[PDB]
Design an enzyme around this catalytic site. Structure first.
Site, PDB file in Angstrom:
ATOM      1  N   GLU A   1      40.750  27.759  41.679  1.00  0.00           N
ATOM      2  CA  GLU A   1      39.633  26.919  42.069  1.00  0.00           C
ATOM      3  C   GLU A   1      39.024  27.517  43.326  1.00  0.00           C
ATOM      4  OE1 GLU A   1      38.304  24.901  39.336  1.00  0.00           O
ATOM      5  OE2 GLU A   1      37.645  24.046  41.231  1.00  0.00           O
ATOM      6  N   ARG A   2      38.178  26.789  44.034  1.00  0.00           N
ATOM      7  CA  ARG A   2      37.483  27.380  45.166  1.00  0.00           C
ATOM      8  C   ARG A   2      38.411  27.567  46.351  1.00  0.00           C
ATOM      9  NH1 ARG A   2      34.885  23.741  42.297  1.00  0.00           N
ATOM     10  NH2 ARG A   2      32.713  24.125  41.745  1.00  0.00           N
TER      11      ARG A   2
ATOM     12  N   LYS B   1      36.829  15.373  40.231  1.00  0.00           N
ATOM     13  CA  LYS B   1      38.246  15.638  40.024  1.00  0.00           C
ATOM     14  C   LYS B   1      38.951  15.965  41.327  1.00  0.00           C
ATOM     15  CE  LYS B   1      37.692  18.972  37.207  1.00  0.00           C
ATOM     16  NZ  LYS B   1      36.219  19.082  37.073  1.00  0.00           N
TER      17      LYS B   1
HETATM   18  N1  LIG Z   1      35.008   9.083  44.798  1.00  0.00           N
HETATM   19  C1  LIG Z   1      33.856   9.671  45.182  1.00  0.00           C
HETATM   20  N2  LIG Z   1      33.070   9.110  46.107  1.00  0.00           N
HETATM   21  C2  LIG Z   1      31.919   9.681  46.490  1.00  0.00           C
HETATM   22  N3  LIG Z   1      31.446  10.825  46.006  1.00  0.00           N
HETATM   23  C3  LIG Z   1      32.144  11.492  45.073  1.00  0.00           C
HETATM   24  C4  LIG Z   1      33.408  10.942  44.593  1.00  0.00           C
HETATM   25  N4  LIG Z   1      33.882  11.792  43.677  1.00  0.00           N
HETATM   26  C5  LIG Z   1      32.988  12.791  43.581  1.00  0.00           C
HETATM   27  N5  LIG Z   1      31.963  12.619  44.408  1.00  0.00           N
HETATM   28  C6  LIG Z   1      30.823  13.540  44.529  1.00  0.00           C
HETATM   29  O1  LIG Z   1      30.926  14.497  43.482  1.00  0.00           O
HETATM   30  C7  LIG Z   1      30.905  15.806  44.028  1.00  0.00           C
HETATM   31  C8  LIG Z   1      31.745  16.742  43.191  1.00  0.00           C
HETATM   32  O2  LIG Z   1      33.082  16.280  43.206  1.00  0.00           O
HETATM   33  P1  LIG Z   1      34.303  17.292  43.157  1.00  0.00           P
HETATM   34  O3  LIG Z   1      35.425  16.662  43.895  1.00  0.00           O
HETATM   35  O4  LIG Z   1      33.810  18.640  43.552  1.00  0.00           O
HETATM   36  O5  LIG Z   1      34.588  17.271  41.583  1.00  0.00           O
HETATM   37  P2  LIG Z   1      34.938  18.574  40.728  1.00  0.00           P
HETATM   38  O6  LIG Z   1      36.106  19.166  41.443  1.00  0.00           O
HETATM   39  O7  LIG Z   1      35.208  17.994  39.388  1.00  0.00           O
HETATM   40  O8  LIG Z   1      33.729  19.450  40.736  1.00  0.00           O
HETATM   41  C9  LIG Z   1      31.493  15.637  45.406  1.00  0.00           C
HETATM   42  O9  LIG Z   1      31.057  16.651  46.303  1.00  0.00           O
HETATM   43  C10 LIG Z   1      30.954  14.298  45.817  1.00  0.00           C
HETATM   44  O10 LIG Z   1      29.642  14.482  46.334  1.00  0.00           O
HETATM   45 MG   LIG Z   2      37.370  20.760  41.661  1.00  0.00          MG
END
Ligand SMILES: Nc1ncnc2c1ncn2[C@@H]1O[C@H](COP(=O)(O)OP(=O)(O)O)[C@@H](O)[C@H]1O
Ligand SMILES: [Mg+2]
Lengths: 521, 50, 141, 70
Positions: free
Chosen positions: A180-181, A154
């Site tokens: 969030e963080r 997300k």
């Molecule tokens: N479009 C993307 N391309 C590559 N890796 C991704 C992508 N989206 C998510 N990830 C992987 O998923 C992990 C968690 O995504 P994150 O942005 O933290 O989602 P959320 O906020 O839902 O936890 C990221 O650290 C990354 O490693």
């Molecule tokens: Mg997030």
């Protein structure tokens, strides 16, 4: 004239007022506190007592502490003077750049616009992300939801929507970081200094974004009102300056979680699975303000956390009726390596009518979803048997869907440190042209992983031609390269002797440090 | 071969009907138990306020 | 719109106002039933009305039942939906046809408000999301 | 240590530990960490990268090793 603290239970403070209680939703100030503690009246308890939620911690509150009524709700600075700054829930700058210049200060509480000043105009917001702009295309001026559980993507998807939509558009942006963080709020801040979206110093007026941050460490009273603070900055840009705003809210789920954390202490018997009884109407009061009116336009993009990958849960399920485009991210798409992990079937948009996006975009999107739905009905029988009884009509729709599945994957320009790939912006016409090729068999001869993490269909042909160069380029280095070289693979202690041996101190020496911290200050 | 696959795929639809029957009994027990559990959580939160 | 009324209690409206909107929409539609004409009432998200009524009842400290709903939440929807009738010939012969809309979650018709309205109504038009992506639209199971 | 992790992951991802029975990969890499050069770990720890002057120089030093069974 003023009130006094009568009860402190967690984040919920009761303030007793001898004469003329403050209005509900109004802001109170506790003087004598170590930090600025702002309370917000949630209800009148009935014996000249109000019940309040605190915007900061209540550690150190004393019964009897003087509370000053401000006479209005929480007022935050709005205007161009907040562009480039990070605000608090209460409008304080948390970026250490001085006070916030303010055109006006506005109450963070207002009503939804009206039914008469609603905008019935649908025009597509092209995002560059081809799974979005094919199957669930976003609306320029509408509410967009990014659903998905923990770790599906997300925040990367909302980061790629920032530099693909907000990096060059006409108006301003507001990022509301809701619960969030703190680490990724600093990551978003430093990324926008380098991208030139936020400029610091004397070039601050050329900024195009305002951050409003209420991250996870803040109490539930704070995180419940950050989304209203960031929306108030976006409502000034829409109502007063009359211009298009982008409003990014990371986890609108945390707004409902924050109200749920104080709810039983406010005297409410709990609703279903653990949320407050006012769950749908607290959420509805927020989302009804994020609208395109006849004055300007707020294009909202809200991440929505679904707890334990459950879209049945009441806080995601209530959000679904508030949005114009619900990009649902799935763990099963993420576990295969397709990124962005968008569920291509579960993602729904209101721009997916043929009289809105045309027929050659609607039929490709309905054609791609039909081939992906059929493959899921065959994947019940492939995983048991193994696709040797599948008719060669059903074998072709397995190969077509597997090409369609990888071709929805796209390298993101912000995920260049997760995936070692430079990111790809795909135009809307190149997405329609590509998936119409994969649907009608124009690219049936290409390999399956040639579609994986590429831009468009011209880069599938530049990758299939690349991999068929580089698999038959395997046997040049087999019979040689073990020996007989130009001696830039040199001897053993040749590489050991340029090792600059760093001095190890062989004791920590912290008790000399601890006495030295005593003499300083 | 076709006539032993027919007797084999008859014995596995029974085994996938006997397993489905034990899972539905197990699901109805969990369905009844989570309705009791969510209700005891709601009454406890209400009795703490009344 | 020359034949349609729209009663709109939106998301920002108070929970008493979303509770009363199917009833005030029904009374507007009961005008045509009672005067010999024919009506078509559609309560879009009757499951959102019950959430608004559960909000009022937990806040009025009424004792909660299953999924924190009141005791009289079956009586809520039955008293509303039983007002859709075909009248007899000595009462004009008018009619009112109701289409309550209930949103399930993961197709669960064993949910508490969903079993209530399935009991009250005559039929159901079940729309399944798995048929929706197969191209079968309207996705009628 | 991190340098003996990446050498053992190099020995498995550069195909030096097939032709080895899958039951004794646990005992195969115990040779691989102990029978390669104790000076090749120091270069990988000091550089932090396996350089082009080392990825051949270690994969040709991952051939002068005795693995069980083989
Ligand atoms: N479009 C993307 N391309 C590559 N890796 C991704 C992508 N989206 C998510 N990830 C992987 O998923 C992990 C968690 O995504 P994150 O942005 O933290 O989602 P959320 O906020 O839902 O936890 C990221 O650290 C990354 O490693
Ligand atoms: Mg997030």
């Amino acid at each position: 004239d003023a009130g006094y603290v009568s009860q402190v239970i967690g984040p919920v403070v009761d303030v007793r007022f001898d004469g003329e209680l403050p209005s509900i939703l109004s802001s109170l100030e506790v003087e004598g506190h170590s930090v600025r503690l702002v309370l917000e009246v949630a209800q009148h308890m009935g014996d000249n007592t109000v019940r309040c939620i605190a915007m900061d911690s209540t550690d150190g509150l004393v019964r009897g502490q003087k509370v000053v009524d401000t006479g209005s709700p929480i007022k935050v600075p709005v205007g161009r003077g907040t562009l480039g700054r990070i605000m608090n829930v209460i409008g304080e700058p948390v970026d250490e750049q001085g006070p916030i210049d303010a055109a006006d200060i506005w109450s963070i509480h207002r009503e939804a616009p009206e039914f008469t000043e609603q905008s019935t105009e649908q025009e597509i917001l092209v995002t560059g992300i081809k799974v979005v702009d094919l199957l669930a295309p976003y609306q320029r001026g509408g509410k967009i939801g990014l659903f998905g559980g923990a770790g599906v993507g997300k925040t990367v998807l909302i980061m790629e929507l920032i530099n693909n939509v907000a990096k060059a558009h006409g108006g301003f942006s507001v990022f509301a970081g809701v619960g969030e963080r703190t680490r990724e709020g600093n990551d978003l801040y430093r990324e926008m200094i380098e991208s030139g979206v936020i400029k610091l110093g004397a070039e601050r007026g050329n900024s195009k974004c305002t951050l409003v941050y209420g991250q996870m460490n803040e109490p539930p009273g704070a995180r419940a009102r950050v989304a209203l603070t960031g929306l108030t900055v976006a409502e000034y840009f829409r109502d007063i300056e009359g211009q298009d705003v982008l409003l990014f809210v990371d986890n609108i789920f945390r707004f409902t979680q924050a109200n749920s954390e104080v709810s039983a202490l406010l005297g409410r018997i709990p609703s279903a699975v653990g949320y407050q009884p006012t769950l749908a109407t607290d959420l509805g009061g927020l989302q009804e303000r994020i609208t395109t009116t006849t004055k300007g336009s707020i294009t909202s993009v809200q991440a929505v956390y679904v707890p334990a990958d459950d879209l049945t849960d009441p806080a995601p399920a209530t959000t679904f009726a508030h949005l114009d485009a619900t990009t649902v991210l799935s763990r099963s798409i993420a576990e295969l390596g397709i990124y962005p992990a968008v569920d291509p079937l579960d993602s729904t948009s209101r721009m997916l009518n043929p009289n809105v996006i045309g027929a050659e975009h609607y039929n490709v999107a309905r054609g791609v979803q039909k081939v992906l739905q059929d493959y899921k009905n065959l994947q019940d029988i492939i995983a048991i048997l193994g696709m040797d009884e599948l008719s060669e009509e059903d074998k072709l729709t397995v190969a077509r869907a597997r090409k369609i599945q990888r071709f929805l994957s796209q390298p993101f320009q912000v995920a260049e440190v997760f995936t070692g790939t430079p990111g790809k912006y795909v135009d809307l016409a190149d997405t329609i042209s590509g998936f119409q090729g994969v649907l009608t068999g124009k690219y049936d001869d290409l390999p399956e992983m040639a579609f994986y993490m590429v831009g468009d269909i011209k880069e599938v042909k530049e990758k299939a031609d690349k991999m068929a160069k580089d698999i038959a380029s395997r046997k040049e280095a087999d019979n040689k390269k073990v020996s007989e070289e130009l001696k830039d693979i040199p001897s053993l202690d040749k590489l050991v002797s340029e090792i600059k041996e760093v001095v190890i101190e062989e004791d920590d020496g912290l008790e000399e440090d601890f006495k030295a911290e005593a003499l300083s200050s | 071969e076709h006539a032993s696959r027919m007797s084999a795929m008859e014995n596995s639809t029974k085994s996938a009907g006997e397993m489905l029957g034990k899972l539905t009994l197990d699901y109805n027990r969990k369905r009844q138990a989570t309705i009791t559990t969510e209700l005891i959580e709601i009454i406890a939160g209400a009795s703490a306020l009344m | 719109m020359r034949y349609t009324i729209m009663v709109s209690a939106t998301a920002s409206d108070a929970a008493p106002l979303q509770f009363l909107a199917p009833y005030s929409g029904c009374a507007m539609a009961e005008y045509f039933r009672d005067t010999g004409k024919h009506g078509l009432i559609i309560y879009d998200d009757l499951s959102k009305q019950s959430v608004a009524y559960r909000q009022m009842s937990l806040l009025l400290r009424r004792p909660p039942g299953r999924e924190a709903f009141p005791g009289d939440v079956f009586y809520l929807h039955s008293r509303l939906l039983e007002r859709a009738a075909k009248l007899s010939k000595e009462l004009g012969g008018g009619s009112l046809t109701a289409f309550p809309v209930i949103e399930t979650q993961a197709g669960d018709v064993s949910a508490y408000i969903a079993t209530n309205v399935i009991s009250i109504t005559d039929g159901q038009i079940f729309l399944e999301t798995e048929l929706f992506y197969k191209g079968i639209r309207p996705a009628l199971n | 240590p991190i340098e003996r992790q990446t050498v053992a992951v190099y020995a498995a991802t550069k195909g030096f530990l097939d032709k080895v029975r899958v039951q004794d990969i646990v005992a195969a890499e115990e040779a691989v960490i102990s029978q390669v050069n104790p000076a090749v770990f120091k270069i990988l720890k000091a550089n932090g990268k396996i350089t082009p002057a080392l990825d051949a120089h270690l994969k040709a030093e991952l051939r002068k090793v005795k693995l069980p069974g083989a």
